[PDB]
Design a protein around this nucleic acid. Sequence first.
DNA 1: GAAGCCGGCG
DNA 2: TCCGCCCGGCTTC
Length: 341
Amino acid sequence: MIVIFVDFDYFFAQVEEVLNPQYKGKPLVVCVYSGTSGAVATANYEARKLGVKAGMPIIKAMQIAPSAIYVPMRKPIYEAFSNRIMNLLNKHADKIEVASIDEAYLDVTNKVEGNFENGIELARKIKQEILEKEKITVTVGVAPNKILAKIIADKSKPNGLGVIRPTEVQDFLNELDIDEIPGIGSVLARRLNELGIQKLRDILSKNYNELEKITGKAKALYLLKLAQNKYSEPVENKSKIPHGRYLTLPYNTRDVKVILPYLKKAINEAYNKVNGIPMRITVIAIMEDLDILSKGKKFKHGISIDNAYKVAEDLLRELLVRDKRRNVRRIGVKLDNIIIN
DNA sequence: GAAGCCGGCG
DNA sequence: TCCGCCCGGCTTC
Ligand SMILES: [Ca+2]
């Protein structure tokens, strides 16, 4: 299997520099507020050079970058920019999994006829295209599987091209750190460092139940199949970007006949946002006191709007059976696990 | 079934 | 030593 992972470099900052050519070459900080407190979404090259990084509060960012331009996040525009690129990728892939707004896995096995060198060249073709057509730099990773593809891209940021060849995968799996693995963050790394597991190879020698006691069976077998080079799971035609919609109600209420006019509208604005068929719907009721009450059906296959209305109804008609106490202030829907066709 | 509590992570 | 109309997973009522 040949998989190309495309990751977009500091996407929001790059989109802003594109629409606003006078930002280039000068510090730029994209900001994000909540339901208020400001933090850094992304920062451009010269901002990052000053030490500005994601999560940083806005006052703090200002202290170290007073000359920066701070602009508000504009999700809709970044989402549309992403979509054009996702569609560019689509023309090249047997299968494409949209992981998030700036990440996508491409199965190109058939496109390059199993030729790994032709896989590498296609990934070069793709960077050059994204740059030419959309003026964005991306980092790609070409690898025998999804996880390795992500890991090698991560290792080659920014504007890079990471390669792991099937005829050399064992040397990569020998030198691979335990911390450099998806699913292993800063806490789980420390606890594996409590057995003398720094690298991936180490687990093969360790007793299997102890790893399970530190990670759970799900990640235990996950790390094993990786170290053993038996991780298989393919790329499906599915988008992981969630599409949702919320409407404030004219007043706090618990009457289904009152809130449904607004839920139908919520589903409307969501399904019309989709292109594909969601494998999960989530009804989200925000209460008077601003507490959250959500329930979803994980559909084996997909859900159409024709199926969705009464599926979303008895979701709420259960949310209220679950909460006879409080009134709904705001109603929202969430569609995700979308099947691509 | 689902509250609660951890951990990844952007 | 960062909150999320995170999200997923595992424990525990
Ligand atoms: Ca990222």
